[PDB]
Design a protein around this ligand. Structure first.
Ligand code: 1O1
Ligand code: MG
Length: 559
């Protein structure tokens, strides 16, 4: 069927939309070619609609059914709990989109009577009505990028706040534990960056002759069929569930997940969706299961040998035993035709890779550097263009979510995160006296509130002390960074080193945690290297829930 149907009403913004990076003294200090940075707006929605609107072709075979059963066998071992209204409310980010029924995220978090009572009526409605398509809002997403040698806006679709809290009640526990139970080590979100690198590196070295490839599905959400979503529900249904949770899942599947009506911000009927909605709780888990199911079966169809996969939502990376250059290229092509029949045609043409550093997955790649001892150390990195562009935008404009903070956290060991992001934001924060103010950022889609001053302990725990001593990065990595800086008009190494020494001096003079940030985060900026010993606070850190599951588009806040 058609992924989308349109009435002709426009996808409208609900306020003024900024498209250009402001000329700001602070941001200009980070990136000078401000004209290369732009934010997508509803003005390009029409372009996106065209690309995501098409008929889906799907042919299921024995391999598909075989794998599905294997997956359900594992799902069968799970017992999901069903969250209380209060537990669900507490999972709503403070900046979550308000309800059209007289209450916002704040009322939900504070368990206001109007919010809880409306939430209860919505739940009761899910138990009683198994057919009525739930309404959803379609909006053009506002994201920042750097121009290329421009991307149209992504379209997000999400139900009312009341429904969102109900989703949490019925499926939060499911989407948090089912993926790992069914997919085991193949489930990417259970890994921290370091553990992802470890898994990838060990898998790679475990092959006699490794061959790997990332597989990019063209607009994955739109390729998801009604069949796919019901297959997804069938897996969820193998879980031991509370009666009400079971009905809620059945109802949400038919009324929301398989599709439904689209309404713009002006309240006008916009069209109909028959594919994955980007803004529901099951999107990450659902996409991961779907991608995993299709790929695993595609692998069997292509006769790839000793396949080891890593799936993060619609992101897939496979590492196998090579059968030789020619055979590999043919097998990859067969794999692709298999995925195509399953309704997951390729966007960028997949290509086999024989150098692990050249494989980009989850927008990142593995690279190696050296610690102070001179020992090789693997770590996760990525082209810094987008991170830097967004860092600039966030410097000039206040944003609910600070991607720079998440990038410092997730890419702490990288040359660019340390040289530029750390230096830039700490100098600004120290100057504005806000080192103590907690800020929100996202990790695998979930929102977290973090204190910049705790960064040293966080980095030590997630990446190890070596994150503060890496040097001698790869020529490929160094060149990518340097070319990025020239492209965006970002100051050179020497400028950042000078700025870094300057902030480090100040951080040290403040004592306490600031001093710790100065010693560990910027030891790279000085010749007189301080001794970096284990930070006591890094022992009493509970960072386990950070890497349990993916929640992008799931409106999740972890506290
Ligand atoms: C966190 C960090 C760690 C070590 C150093 S270093 O000064 O000890 N060595 C390097 C300094 C710059 C660099 O990569 C660049 C970056 C920018 C430019 C440039 O501005 O053109 C040139 C080389 C790579 C390395 C290395 O150890 O491999 C600087 C920053
Ligand atoms: Mg894709």
């Amino acid at each position: 069927s058609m992924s989308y149907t349109w009435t002709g009403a426009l996808i409208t913004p609900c306020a003024a939309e900024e498209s250009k990076l402001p000329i700001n003294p602070l941001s200009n200090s980070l990136l000078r070619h401000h004209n290369m940075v732009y934010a997508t707006t509803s003005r390009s929605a029409s372009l996106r609609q065209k690309k995501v609107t098409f008929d889906r072709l799907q042919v299921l075979d024995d391999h598909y059914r075989d794998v599905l059963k294997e997956m359900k066998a594992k799902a069968s071992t799970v017992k999901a709990k069903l969250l209380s209204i209060e537990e669900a409310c507490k999972l709503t980010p403070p900046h979550s989109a308000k309800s059209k029924f007289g209450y916002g995220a704040k009322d939900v978090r504070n368990l206001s009577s109007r919010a809880v009572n409306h939430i209860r009526s919505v739940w009761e409605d899910l138990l009683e009505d198994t057919e009525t398509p739930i309404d959803t809002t379609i909006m053009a997403k506002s994201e920042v990028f750097c121009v290329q040698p421009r991307k149209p806006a992504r379209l997000i679709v999400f139900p009312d706040l009341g429904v969102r809290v109900c989703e949490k009640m019925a499926l939060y526990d499911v989407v948090s534990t089912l993926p790992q139970a069914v997919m085991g080590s193949s489930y990417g979100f259970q890994y921290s960056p370091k553990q992802r690198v470890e898994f990838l590196v060990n898998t790679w070295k475990s092959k006699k002759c490794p061959m790997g490839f990332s597989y990019d599905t063209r607009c994955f959400d739109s390729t998801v069929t009604e069949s796919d979503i019901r297959v997804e529900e069938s897996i969820y249904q193998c879980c031991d569930l509370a009666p009400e949770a079971r009905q809620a899942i059945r109802s949400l599947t038919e009324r929301l997940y398989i599709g439904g009506p689209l309404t713009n911000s002006k309240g006008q009927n916009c069209g109909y969706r028959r594919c994955r909605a980007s803004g529901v709780l099951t999107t990450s888990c659902g996409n991961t299961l779907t991608c995993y199911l299709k790929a695993t079966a595609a692998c069997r169809a292509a006769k790839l040998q000793d396949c080891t996969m890593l799936v993060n939502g619609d992101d897939l990376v496979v590492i196998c035993e090579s059968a030789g250059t020619q055979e590999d290229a043919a097998a990859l092509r067969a794999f692709t035709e298999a995925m195509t029949r399953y309704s997951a045609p390729p966007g960028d043409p997949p290509q086999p890779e024989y150098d692990l550093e050249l494989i980009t997955s989850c927008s990142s790649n593995v690279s190696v550097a050296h610690d102070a001892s001179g020992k090789r150390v693997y770590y996760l990195t990525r082209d810094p263009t987008t991170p830097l562009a967004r860092a600039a935008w966030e410097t000039a404009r206040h944003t609910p979510i600070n991607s720079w903070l998440g990038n410092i956290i997730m890419y702490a060991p990288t040359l660019w995160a340390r040289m530029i992001l750390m230096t830039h934001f700490f100098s600004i924060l120290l100057a504005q006296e806000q080192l103590e103010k907690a800020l929100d950022c996202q990790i695998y889609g979930a929102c977290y509130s973090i204190e910049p001053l705790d960064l040293p302990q966080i980095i030590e725990r997630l990446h190890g002390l070596s994150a503060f001593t890496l040097h001698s990065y790869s020529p490929g990595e160094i060149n990518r960074v340097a070319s990025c800086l020239r492209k965006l008009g970002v100051p050179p190494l020497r400028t950042w080193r000078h700025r870094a020494r300057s902030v480090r001096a100040k951080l040290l003079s403040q004592g306490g945690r600031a001093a710790t940030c100065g010693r560990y985060l910027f030891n790279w900026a000085v010749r007189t290297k301080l001794k970096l010993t284990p930070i006591p606070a890094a022992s009493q850190l509970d960072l386990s829930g950070w890497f349990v599951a993916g929640y992008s588009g799931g409106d999740i806040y972890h506290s």
